[PDB]
Ligand binder design. Structure first.
Ligand SMILES: Cc1cc2nc3c(=O)[nH]c(=O)nc-3n(C[C@H](O)[C@H](O)[C@H](O)COP(=O)(O)O)c2cc1C
Ligand SMILES: Cc1cc2nc3c(=O)[nH]c(=O)nc-3n(C[C@H](O)[C@H](O)[C@H](O)COP(=O)(O)O)c2cc1C
Ligand SMILES: Cc1cc2nc3c(=O)[nH]c(=O)nc-3n(C[C@H](O)[C@H](O)[C@H](O)COP(=O)(O)O)c2cc1C
Ligand SMILES: Cc1cc2nc3c(=O)[nH]c(=O)nc-3n(C[C@H](O)[C@H](O)[C@H](O)COP(=O)(O)O)c2cc1C
Ligand SMILES: Cc1cc2nc3c(=O)[nH]c(=O)nc-3n(C[C@H](O)[C@H](O)[C@H](O)COP(=O)(O)O)c2cc1C
Ligand SMILES: Cc1cc2nc3c(=O)[nH]c(=O)nc-3n(C[C@H](O)[C@H](O)[C@H](O)COP(=O)(O)O)c2cc1C
Ligand SMILES: Cc1cc2nc3c(=O)[nH]c(=O)nc-3n(C[C@H](O)[C@H](O)[C@H](O)COP(=O)(O)O)c2cc1C
Ligand SMILES: Cc1cc2nc3c(=O)[nH]c(=O)nc-3n(C[C@H](O)[C@H](O)[C@H](O)COP(=O)(O)O)c2cc1C
Ligand SMILES: Cc1cc2nc3c(=O)[nH]c(=O)nc-3n(C[C@H](O)[C@H](O)[C@H](O)COP(=O)(O)O)c2cc1C
Ligand SMILES: Cc1cc2nc3c(=O)[nH]c(=O)nc-3n(C[C@H](O)[C@H](O)[C@H](O)COP(=O)(O)O)c2cc1C
Ligand SMILES: Cc1cc2nc3c(=O)[nH]c(=O)nc-3n(C[C@H](O)[C@H](O)[C@H](O)COP(=O)(O)O)c2cc1C
Ligand SMILES: Cc1cc2nc3c(=O)[nH]c(=O)nc-3n(C[C@H](O)[C@H](O)[C@H](O)COP(=O)(O)O)c2cc1C
Lengths: 180, 180, 180, 180, 180, 180
């Protein structure tokens, strides 16, 4: 990798722990953001519109079908790919080798080049989504979500994490490895 | 249970997600706190000294060897027992039927009376503990921690949860069941 | 054993059949009582405060972390160890080789010296606890209680009994063996 | 670890080979002692009262329920945890992930942080305890003691040793690794 | 069942826990007694002669070969059949479908009509029978007694209980079911 | 055996725990020493030259190819054979039925006559041998040593012990059996 290589932090269209995920990315020494089309829609709804993101990050939008920004991986510009948060959709696509979004292309190309990937899968446990003070909706991962997490966790050069704490740990191990 | 039955929320000597756990307890309609001896030492270190807790809760300290406050379970005063956060130590004791602290006695007696228990086990995944801005310690659960979580998760009338989100979901299901 | 060796009768913090257990101990030719910390709290609630016990027995309280009174086993002063009643907690500790109370230390040290132990396990069957004339609570042993009884029943030099009648029988066999 | 990191040598309430264990600790370049409550009672009976220990060691007593001194592990102050001698009780607690004493908390926290532990289990073989010149008591480990030693010996980052000689060897290997 | 349906409490010729069994029957809201021929002989020997029983109960003697009083089951007069205490003899007869006494006919006819039966089997554990202050006889259940208890415990609409405590629990569950 | 029968204590050319082994032999009521050729060379190096040994013991040197002193076993002069310490070499020879030294002949002939043998095998665990204050050598038993210990431990009339404590226990049991 180049001496000043960076984290490639991909964001998908997940509202789940989105703010906390960006908060962690903010703590990293050098990271650029790579968005899916859905992320670009979802991020403004949770406090992270593009103009705010660009105060802190270089931000690459998903505006090509071929995933043109992934070409930077060939130039040693990114030492690690992160997907956080990862929608169930993106976990499914990664697990089956589908790459038709910027984050799934970044992940697949990283793997082909033996670049470490860290994937924060957010559908491993039940959760609660509230609308009013005394009304809420419980979400429960389905068999397919759980199976896809298991599938992806077995991938080469991939650390699948299931919580913010574990994401922090994976990032910390990567930083230690890179002597950063 | 009595018409005005409450949550029995037990706290153990865990700094891990302690503040967020108390925050959830604060949201419940009626809950009393039951501390281990270690909790009484640890809680003040993280912003929850007894005088602050007592502004919001009835608080029972672990000051008897026999677990005298557990007698209230026999009077239909508590419809649910929670342990959150639960130290690895308390998960181990619960898993093997040891009850020599107020929280482990509350849990065991609940089970014998078929009162639902919800246990927030905090040692299921790696995590990071920081001391200085650029120095930190990674913790990793051992086989025994993982095995004990598996053991306890199989207990009658017990919902073992592994995250704050899942704890919220379990609490929400309980509230729905009780029509609260 | 010394010519005038005695029964070492350990009491734990169990209200269950406590009065009947002490009644049986009273019938034995020479027995001393060894209490857990919880027993010292529970016994007065059921008619057996320390001053009443001391009219009939030498009574050893659990007031050392190391279980100092157990040293008397090394001097041939006790030919038999009894635990009656035994809490689920003490059955669990005995079953896993934990000895951090006077009764569990007495039991473990007895075993290491091949001194017969008799353990009255009180959580083998459902029971009823009453509060008012027409209101009561049913207790039901959990899998862990049943499993721990099975575990402990297999121990060397150990007779696990599940009723007062069977405790009487075990005591009677011991008396016959000792020609008392 | 810090440049001047030390051995964390835990002592439990075992009279067995206690004097020889302290003798070995005395030979180590830098070691602090961490006592259980039972150790504090037992040590004076065998020639090692606290004032004598403190001529040679920093000594931490077990005077908190939460195991406050273990916090020093997070600061890289101890490169190794030793438990020697280890009572059957402490071996049992370690084997099942119970940590409610200073030594068992030191051991568990070491493991979670991948700090090497060395445990001198003293109940692996029959032994003789004498009272008078021509009278003595044979002790024999029970199945549960032997099983617990086997269990603990399989733990991550743990070297279970069964003799003083093997403890010396383990310490020597650790010193060689640390280039001390 | 009729609105004022009763317990049909059968007594067999067992001296074992007979007084305590009648004591429990006395606590039930509405119960009639149904005796075997042997019960009629044994009951007076233990404090419960027919005239004393009839101060508290309607009492049906076993004075017909066909078990004429069992006809009352067809009229919805009894919501539950109890046998307590049950001799080994009556447990054996029930287990093999033999009905040639009033209690065994009550039990079999209850089963055919899907009326719940509760059977207190008294030969599951060793016990002691005393004659003089320092002389006694130990009884031990044989394989056939243990096997027959296992057999009967599997019967439809049957709760086999092995202690007074468990009998109380079964009765309590029945009362709760019947909203009594 | 003769009324004044003795222990036949064999010594091999082991420096390991040699001084402590002789110390135990000194405590026995009546024991004679039987040396291998290697023992006669090694003993003076560790404080036990023949003239010192002969102040306390009758000492038989290995100065015949046929093991002439073993003839005393035929005359009921020795009730027990001990080998302590036993070199790996002597454990190997005993395990395979080789008897071409005084100790291995004493052991084999004892076995053929059903005379109890106690063998202190010293190669069951790693150990440390020091030369200078800060330099030492670790020894580790090989598979063949461990296998041979297992083999010999299965021999008729043989108690294989792996520590000084266990040797003391075996000797104590023998003394108790012989009412000495
Ligand atoms: C269309 C939509 C889909 C969502 N899907 C998920 C999901 O798959 N998993 C999840 O944990 N939360 C999901 N959420 C919840 C958001 O991530 C987040 O919690 C936020 O509070 C949304 O609030 P709201 O759905 O009530 O409008 C979803 C929200 C929306 C609007
Ligand atoms: C406000 C909002 C919040 C959402 N949150 C989630 C979520 O937390 N997890 C999830 O799997 N999908 C969530 N979705 C649905 C995804 O955006 C949707 O599946 C999309 O196709 C994901 O595409 P992507 O994986 O390429 O980013 C959300 C949708 C909306 C509109
Ligand atoms: C003695 C001690 C034990 C701890 N044990 C754990 C643990 O088992 N699991 C965990 O997630 N955090 C553990 N922590 C971390 C605290 O829960 C919490 O994260 C806090 O930040 C402690 O900061 P500090 O250890 O650096 O002093 C422990 C902290 C201390 C002092
Ligand atoms: C400041 C501090 C923080 C701690 N945090 C944790 C923790 O997050 N998880 C854990 O298993 N133990 C933690 N410990 C250790 C426990 O307090 C210790 O094991 C204690 O025996 C637990 O007892 P309890 O389960 O009855 O509450 C901590 C200790 C201290 C002093
Ligand atoms: C805190 C507490 C725990 C008890 N635990 C048990 C138990 O595990 N098993 C049991 O048979 N009885 C148990 N009991 C019941 C007492 O042993 C005894 O039956 C007595 O009647 C207690 O009355 P009470 O609980 O209504 O106050 C418990 C009672 C209390 C107060
Ligand atoms: C009034 C009272 C009665 C209790 N009765 C029982 C009981 O019958 N059985 C039981 O397992 N625990 C019972 N407990 C709970 C035990 O006292 C508790 O588990 C304690 O930790 C036991 O410690 P020990 O085994 O060392 O004596 C009771 C507690 C109280 C306050
Ligand atoms: C209460 C007590 C418990 C003991 N437990 C053990 C033990 O579990 N294992 C052991 O090898 N020695 C044990 N010992 C023996 C001491 O560790 C030590 O050998 C010392 O000589 C004790 O002498 P004494 O028991 O005759 O008073 C115990 C001694 C006492 C007093
Ligand atoms: C004088 C004395 C010596 C003891 N020696 C031993 C011993 O050698 N081994 C052992 O397992 N227990 C021994 N015990 C019993 C332990 O001290 C007891 O089990 C205690 O609960 C251990 O607690 P700990 O493991 O936290 O230190 C001894 C007790 C006394 C009073
Ligand atoms: C003929 C006879 C048979 C008995 N059978 C039993 C029995 O099978 N099981 C039992 O627990 N007790 C049995 N007992 C004991 C009585 O139920 C009861 O305990 C009473 O104390 C009888 O005293 P006794 O036999 O010494 O005369 C029997 C007693 C007698 C006389
Ligand atoms: C005084 C006395 C007490 C008895 N106690 C018992 C007993 O406790 N258990 C038992 O199985 N048989 C006992 N028997 C024997 C039974 O009465 C005998 O087996 C009889 O045939 C039982 O008939 P039944 O089951 O129809 O009532 C006792 C007999 C007598 C005379
Ligand atoms: C030739 C020789 C062989 C030895 N073999 C062993 C052995 O097989 N096992 C052992 O525990 N010690 C062995 N030792 C060590 C001695 O038994 C003893 O520990 C003593 O301290 C020897 O010191 P030194 O070897 O440094 O000269 C041996 C020593 C020597 C000189
Ligand atoms: C000073 C010295 C110490 C020795 N210590 C040991 C020892 O501790 N264990 C061992 O297996 N061999 C040891 N040996 C090697 C044995 O003496 C050697 O294998 C010899 O052949 C043993 O013969 P033996 O079994 O008939 O006595 C030592 C040798 C020397 C010179």
């Amino acid at each position: 990798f180049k001496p000043d290589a960076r984290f490639a932090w991909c964001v998908t269209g997940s509202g789940h722990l989105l703010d906390e995920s960006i908060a962690l990315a903010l703590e990293l020494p050098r990271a650029d953001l790579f968005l899916s089309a859905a992320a670009e829609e979802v991020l403004p709804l949770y406090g992270w519109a593009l103009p705010r993101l660009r105060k802190h990050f270089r931000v690459f939008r998903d505006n090509s079908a071929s995933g043109v920004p992934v070409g930077m991986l060939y130039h040693g510009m990114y030492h690690t790919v992160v997907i956080a948060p990862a929608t169930s959709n993106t976990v499914a696509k990664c697990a089956f080798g589908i790459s038709d979004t910027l984050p799934t292309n970044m992940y697949a190309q990283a793997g082909k080049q033996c670049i470490p990937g860290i994937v924060f899968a957010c559908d491993t446990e039940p959760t609660v989504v509230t609308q009013s003070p005394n009304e809420w909706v419980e979400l429960r991962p389905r068999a397919i979500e759980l199976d896809n997490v298991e599938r992806l966790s077995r991938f080469e050069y991939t650390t699948l994490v299931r919580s913010l704490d574990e994401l922090k740990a994976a990032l910390g191990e990567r930083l230690s490895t890179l002597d950063l």
